[PDB]
Amino acid sequence: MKFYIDDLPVLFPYPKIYPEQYNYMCDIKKTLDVGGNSILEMPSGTGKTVSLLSLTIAYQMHYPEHRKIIYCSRTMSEIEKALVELENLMDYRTKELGYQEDFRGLGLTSRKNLCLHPEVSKERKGTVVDEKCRRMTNGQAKRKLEEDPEANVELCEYHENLYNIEVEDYLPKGVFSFEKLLKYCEEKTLCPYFIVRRMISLCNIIIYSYHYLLDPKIAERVSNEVSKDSIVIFDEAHNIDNVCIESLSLDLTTDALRRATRGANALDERISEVRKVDSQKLQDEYEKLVQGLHSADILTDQEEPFVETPVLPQDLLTEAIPGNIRRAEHFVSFLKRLIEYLKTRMKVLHVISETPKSFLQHLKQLTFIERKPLRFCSERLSLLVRTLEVTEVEDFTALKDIATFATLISTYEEGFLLIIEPYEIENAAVPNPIMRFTCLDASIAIKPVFERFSSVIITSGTISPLDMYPRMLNFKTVLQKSYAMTLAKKSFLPMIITKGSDQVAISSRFEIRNDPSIVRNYGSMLVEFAKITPDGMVVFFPSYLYMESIVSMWQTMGILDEVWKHKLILVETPDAQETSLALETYRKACSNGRGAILLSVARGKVSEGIDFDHQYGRTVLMIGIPFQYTESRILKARLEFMRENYRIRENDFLSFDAMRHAAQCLGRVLRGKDDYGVMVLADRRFSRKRSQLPKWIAQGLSDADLNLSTDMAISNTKQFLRTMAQPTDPKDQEGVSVWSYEDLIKHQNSRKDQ
Amino acid sequence: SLSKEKLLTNLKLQQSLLKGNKVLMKVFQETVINAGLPPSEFWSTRIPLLRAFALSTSQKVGPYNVLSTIKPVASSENKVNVNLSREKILNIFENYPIVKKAYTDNVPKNFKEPEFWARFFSSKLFRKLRGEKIMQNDRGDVIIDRYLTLDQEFDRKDDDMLLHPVKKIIDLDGNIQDDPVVRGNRPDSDGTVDILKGMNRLSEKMIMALKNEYSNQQMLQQLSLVMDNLINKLDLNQVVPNNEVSNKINKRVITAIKINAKQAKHNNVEVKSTLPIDLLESCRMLHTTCCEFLKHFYIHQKQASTVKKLYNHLKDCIEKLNELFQDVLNGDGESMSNTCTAYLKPVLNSITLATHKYDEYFNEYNN
Amino acid sequence: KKRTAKKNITPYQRGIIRSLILTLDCSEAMLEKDLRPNRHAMIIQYAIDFVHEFFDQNPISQMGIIIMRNGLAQLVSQVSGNPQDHIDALKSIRKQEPKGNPSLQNALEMARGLLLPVPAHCTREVLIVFGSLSTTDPGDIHQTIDSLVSEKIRVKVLGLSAQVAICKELCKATNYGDESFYKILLDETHLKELFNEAVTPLPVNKINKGFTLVKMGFPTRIFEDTPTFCSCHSKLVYGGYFCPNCHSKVCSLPTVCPCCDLMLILSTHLARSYHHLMPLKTFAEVPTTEKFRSEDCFSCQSRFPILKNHKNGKLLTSSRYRCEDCKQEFCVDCDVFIHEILHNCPGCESK
Ligand code: SF4
Ligand SMILES: [Zn+2]
Ligand SMILES: [Zn+2]
Ligand SMILES: [Zn+2]
Numbered sequence A: 001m002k003f004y005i006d007d008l009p010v011l012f013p014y015p016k017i018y019p020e021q022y023n024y025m026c027d028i029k030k031t032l033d034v035g036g037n038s039i040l041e042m043p044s045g046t047g048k049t050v051s052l053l054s055l056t057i058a059y060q061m062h063y064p065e066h067r068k069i070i071y072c073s074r075t076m077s078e079i080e081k082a083l084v085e086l087e088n089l090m091d092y093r094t095k096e097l098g099y100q101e102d103f104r105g106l107g108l109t110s111r112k113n114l115c116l117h118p119e120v121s122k123e124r125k126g127t128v129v130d131e132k133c134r135r136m137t138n139g140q141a142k143r144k145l146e147e148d149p150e151a152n153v154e155l156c157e158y159h160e161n162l163y164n165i166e167v168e169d170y171l172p173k174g175v176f177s178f179e180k181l182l183k184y185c186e187e188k189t190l191c192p193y194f195i196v197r198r199m200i201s202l203c204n205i206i207i208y209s210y211h212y213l214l215d216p217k218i219a220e221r222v223s224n225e226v227s228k229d230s231i232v233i234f235d236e237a238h239n240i241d242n243v244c245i246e247s248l249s250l251d252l253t254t255d256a257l258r259r260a261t262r263g264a265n266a267l268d269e270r271i272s273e274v275r276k277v278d279s280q281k282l283q284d285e286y287e288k289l290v291q292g293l294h295s296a297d298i299l300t301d302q303e304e305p306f307v308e309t310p311v312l313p314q315d316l317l318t319e320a321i322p323g324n325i326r327r328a329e330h331f332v333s334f335l336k337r338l339i340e341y342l343k344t345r346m347k348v349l350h351v352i353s354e355t356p357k358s359f360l361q362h363l364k365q366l367t368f369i370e371r372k373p374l375r376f377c378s379e380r381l382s383l384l385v386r387t388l389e390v391t392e393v394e395d396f397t398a399l400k401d402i403a404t405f406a407t408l409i410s411t412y413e414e415g416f417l418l419i420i421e422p423y424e425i426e427n428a429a430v431p432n433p434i435m436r437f438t439c440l441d442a443s444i445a446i447k448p449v450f451e452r453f454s455s456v457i458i459t460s461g462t463i464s465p466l467d468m469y470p471r472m473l474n475f476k477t478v479l480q481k482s483y484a485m486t487l488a489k490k491s492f493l494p495m496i497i498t499k500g501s502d503q504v505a506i507s508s509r510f511e512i513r514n515d516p517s518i519v520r521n522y523g524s525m526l527v528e529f530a531k532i533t534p535d536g537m538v539v540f541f542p543s544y545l546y547m548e549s550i551v552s553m554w555q556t557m558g559i560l561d562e563v564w565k566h567k568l569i570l571v572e573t574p575d576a577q578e579t580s581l582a583l584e585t586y587r588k589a590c591s592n593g594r595g596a597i598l599l600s601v602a603r604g605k606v607s608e609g610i611d612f613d614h615q616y617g618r619t620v621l622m623i624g625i626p627f628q629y630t631e632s633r634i635l636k637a638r639l640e641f642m643r644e645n646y647r648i649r650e651n652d653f654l655s656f657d658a659m660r661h662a663a664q665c666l667g668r669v670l671r672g673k674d675d676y677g678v679m680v681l682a683d684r685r686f687s688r689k690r691s692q693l694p695k696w697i698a699q700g701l702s703d704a705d706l707n708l709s710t711d712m713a714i715s716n717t718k719q720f721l722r723t724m725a726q727p728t729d730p731k732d733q734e735g736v737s738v739w740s741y742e743d744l745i746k747h748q749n750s751r752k753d754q
Numbered sequence B: 001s002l003s004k005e006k007l008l009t010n011l012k013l014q015q016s017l018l019k020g021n022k023v024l025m026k027v028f029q030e031t032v033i034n035a036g037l038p039p040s041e042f043w044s045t046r047i048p049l050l051r052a053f054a055l056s057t058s059q060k061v062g063p064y065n066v067l068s069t070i071k072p073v074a075s076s077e078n079k080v081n082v083n084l085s086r087e088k089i090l091n092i093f094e095n096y097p098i099v100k101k102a103y104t105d106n107v108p109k110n111f112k113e114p115e116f117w118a119r120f121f122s123s124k125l126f127r128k129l130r131g132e133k134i135m136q137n138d139r140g141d142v143i144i145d146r147y148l149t150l151d152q153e154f155d156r157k158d159d160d161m162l163l164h165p166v167k168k169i170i171d172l173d174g175n176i177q178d179d180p181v182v183r184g185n186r187p188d189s190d191g192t193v194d195i196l197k198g199m200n201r202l203s204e205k206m207i208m209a210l211k212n213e214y215s216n217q218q219m220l221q222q223l224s225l226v227m228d229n230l231i232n233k234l235d236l237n238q239v240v241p242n243n244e245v246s247n248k249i250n251k252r253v254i255t256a257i258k259i260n261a262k263q264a265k266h267n268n269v270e271v272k273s274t275l276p277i278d279l280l281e282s283c284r285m286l287h288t289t290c291c292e293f294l295k296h297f298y299i300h301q302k303q304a305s306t307v308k309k310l311y312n313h314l315k316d317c318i319e320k321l322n323e324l325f326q327d328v329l330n331g332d333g334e335s336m337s338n339t340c341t342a343y344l345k346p347v348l349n350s351i352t353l354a355t356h357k358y359d360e361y362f363n364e365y366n367n
Numbered sequence C: 001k002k003r004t005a006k007k008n009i010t011p012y013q014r015g016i017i018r019s020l021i022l023t024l025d026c027s028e029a030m031l032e033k034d035l036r037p038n039r040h041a042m043i044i045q046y047a048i049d050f051v052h053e054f055f056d057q058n059p060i061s062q063m064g065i066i067i068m069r070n071g072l073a074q075l076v077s078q079v080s081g082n083p084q085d086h087i088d089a090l091k092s093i094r095k096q097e098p099k100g101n102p103s104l105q106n107a108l109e110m111a112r113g114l115l116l117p118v119p120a121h122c123t124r125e126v127l128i129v130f131g132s133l134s135t136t137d138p139g140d141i142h143q144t145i146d147s148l149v150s151e152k153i154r155v156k157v158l159g160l161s162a163q164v165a166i167c168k169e170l171c172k173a174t175n176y177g178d179e180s181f182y183k184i185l186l187d188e189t190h191l192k193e194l195f196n197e198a199v200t201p202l203p204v205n206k207i208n209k210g211f212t213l214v215k216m217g218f219p220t221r222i223f224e225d226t227p228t229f230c231s232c233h234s235k236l237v238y239g240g241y242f243c244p245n246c247h248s249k250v251c252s253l254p255t256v257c258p259c260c261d262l263m264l265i266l267s268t269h270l271a272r273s274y275h276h277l278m279p280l281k282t283f284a285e286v287p288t289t290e291k292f293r294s295e296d297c298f299s300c301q302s303r304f305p306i307l308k309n310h311k312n313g314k315l316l317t318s319s320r321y322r323c324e325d326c327k328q329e330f331c332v333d334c335d336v337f338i339h340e341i342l343h344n345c346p347g348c349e350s351k
């Protein structure tokens, strides 16, 4: 199609359209006209990605100003989803237009999933791979190699071929999805990571995960060339706040503290030996401190920066010397005092939580070490290590942990809160004190971007209610609109199976435990569904331990034998690799004959990015409703902050979060409108939350479908599956809900110009 | 898998099919043991039967359920050889090498029928399936424990042999944490995790064992009007309606009709010498298949010598049946011989016509 | 308020010859209780009905029956043109009870093997009456589907109360992409009409394929009675047919000559074909107030026309559903009867 938005050619890649998509285009354009934020809940039953990209590409390529687009999907999985879809859009746009492209748009993830060097990438832990690539191609090992040709220094050489040809120019012209990028850069033997990383200065539109936007420890290279004005799109933004918090929290365990002790000892050895060999350079660095923050080589570092800056991006940093810390031995002694104070405060008997200011004063009491010198510890340690040009980091992992802790707790205040839990009550009365440190205000991490960028979007197939986010994140919006699934047919059957056959209220709320009534009830539910649905089914237990116990003692009964007799079982397990393997076998079985069941965790990785299309998902479940307070009081503290700072009570917030995750789980089971699928729930408490759900889910959830028993549930879903199976394709009722090629939109809404 | 020459040469398959049907083996031998047909062409007629049989044979059952089930759906019959005993155990063997190996190793001694499977219950059906027995009946001894130890690392290496570089849509590994280097929290107790890995491993092994791909006008109106009038002219004396008029005409009509009734009645919609009847039936079947092969070949075409052999044999068969009729007339007399000649008239005519047609074609080709 | 097909848009080609290999489903699933006796008994009963019907309307084709028990496909009737054999086979099966899981893959492979001898002009087909919600394959399936579509073997399946993704892929795949053949049912009557519509030949929009003249000859009945003698079953049979060319007796059939192997037919089979090729235009329902036509039937003489102004009764409709080309009326019963049983339109015959 090529219709108009009263100025904008739109090269929508499909002959068909959807109505909701057209409204989406209209409203997002209206947003881009006037600087605002205007969160927009478009049900995932449609294609939100196609609408977003089509309109935004057309806008950027039509007006002359907003030259760059930033797209932040939650996980690299959705990164490549957006990438492949964008590539197809681009091909369509060229095909309809000839060649008017001149367009580049690149994904951006990390070394671990990009480093092509065989031996390097053979490593598993991402941090190690990062370190290996750093050493193999640093500003220093290159000098060691070139000045001293020797077997000591090797290189990916992909960095070298880049240095030869790629950093004069760019990749040919494509919007390279990771499949395409990896294939090509394998052929031409390049290092994809550095390729895209340097390329950022030229890509018309960039796609990268949230962390690269909010995690200050990697959101450093944000080069306002990237936007300065750009139009920014948050896809799948319902889990924003937790990304901020997890980007700003921090953990401590006595064992890591002892590791830091070992690292400090190794540091003493290193400084001793080097100052025996060379100290004049160390004094030169003393002078480079005394002149200023040493930005000339604490910041002008093509390859150097060792310890990231966990504080917000340099906003809350001074630039003078850290006074006495200028001496390296002084610094080591400072860290010694710090770690010992941490140990003794760690031996505290029971739970204790403090404001950072309070803890700061207490440390001052025990050892008068001031805040201002403390803040500089991170870069101090990092550049000291650079001056030490150490051969390994594993010894210093705990050191950088402590540096991060010091910087955070010395920098921010009155938004964060310490807490010292001496143990894990799930195995209480054991030695395992943890110095948990976390933020409370989600807005802190976001605030810089809403400060920087002007026109931003928020979009998800699940966001609800559309007012909690302006509250929590403390940001101004314009258009807070929700879109309704205009369907000429039912197409999915939300239910609330509150009572099993025993007509007994059920949930996971009681405990994390057994109560054979509940267990047998759920097992009956699951097995009858496994009998009835065709290939493809999911479940979403509320928490991992819950699944572990439940399935263990299901296997105790014979319940699993029956579902074995019908379909396949594919559990969800903590190691990511095996999880991916299981998931792909699930897909392979669904599209094959045998039906297959995958049971996972709502909070877990599976729900985050994985998609469940027509075949791959028919009948999700929600065994229980996901809640967190199973574990300790960090949620309690954050909720305290919530109540005092925002006019929000506990159960309100808890229910809101729970329904957020529930909707995120549920929305996965549809892709288009041709798709369909049951979406059951299961708990007594669900019945009253019917309003918390996103609108388009609520519409399909009629009143009569509440607190149904399992038996009537099976009846209804049987009738559904049969009815949907029919080829109910009048194709004239689809002129209502499809707005066919170039005309029904044109006719209908060009008349609706009223 | 199935080819014309393949079924032609599948001699063991062909003899198995001979064993399949008494009628089949009978007709075949009397086409062979009677110095008749080489089996090659005999099957060349019957090929579809061979194909069908072969396919009905080599039909591997699925793995899947019964394979699994052999560990789950099989927990009761503690008696002797239970349901699908050999079938279930072979499903086990394809399903799990370890049990097959242990049973084989425990053939020369320690019978795996009763006591082997009894100890197997404990050992395996605790190892696989349900939770770690650990305590309780630790009968997993000797071969059981050894194979346990084996199977541990064995399943390990299998799982190792399973790892693909999954396409980057699903790549949860690269998805999780391998973007950043972050600091979270985590808060969501050993054992049973192994149970979950067990079910995953079983399913994936199953699926992989399946990806393995193993006058007109004027006078017309005048007469019409005349008749119309006649009708309108009162008339229509149904009394005068013929009745039959000429008694003679009536009689003649009756004659015609009784003649036709007789002729069509002749349609009465039981041989004497049952042994000679069966013998003649065998002869008919023989001559029928013989002619079958000719009327195949004489139509189709370069295997002229094969046609020549067929024709010589057919002429021999014709003379044979002539002698058969002679002997029948001699022994059974006339009435029985007449009945035999009647029973064999159609086939005899057909083969004679085939012979004449071949003679004509041979003369045409030669002259 | 009408439920009519708008128009027929392949009234130019069908597969007149057929070789349909119906495959039943005899597996543990078919033992649930949704259809009155069970799935299985009702299935086999309707299967018998369909066998009779299909061998009537397509009286020149063959057919073979396949079950799916214990994950195995066990042929229960060779591909043959005599309805009675298949009928008896089904009779035998119906007293036997299902077990094991349906191995769709094995049945598919057995069919593909089975239909090899069928010559090019003859057309192949399969009809899976799939009842369960799973399969159990000893091999790759997409391998088989690819082999199938390579061997030009259309497939139509009639699922029971669900939709299975692989089956949908299967139908969409073999039938030149055009997906319409995975119809699944929602009622027993729906099932009867399902089989009924399975009876007819199958067009979608045929690719331009080889069209080939086929040699065949017609027989002449025999006269004698005591001379009972047979060359297709080697018995005494009081009188039959003669191959015009092979010139040997053959018990009553449209069968293939067992001596010289050429097809035998009378004509009435060809007449059935003719009926299927070029059907009639669907009879139109005349306007309620705009008809002003004769108040009777035409083919019959029915008195069911109207009522002339009766508030709601006359406002309903005017039973005058009248065919187009002859433009003569016909009551509903007459139109149903014409379009179902006899296809010579009464008036359109006469002019
Ligand atoms: S970017 Fe190049 S040098 Fe770095 S890890 Fe990847 S392949 Fe190795
Ligand atoms: Zn016969
Ligand atoms: Zn013949
Ligand atoms: Zn009538």
Ligand SMILES: [Zn+2]
Pocket (backbone or CB within 6 Å): C323, C324, C325, C326, C327, C328, C345, C346, C347, C348, C349
């Ligand atoms: Zn007509």
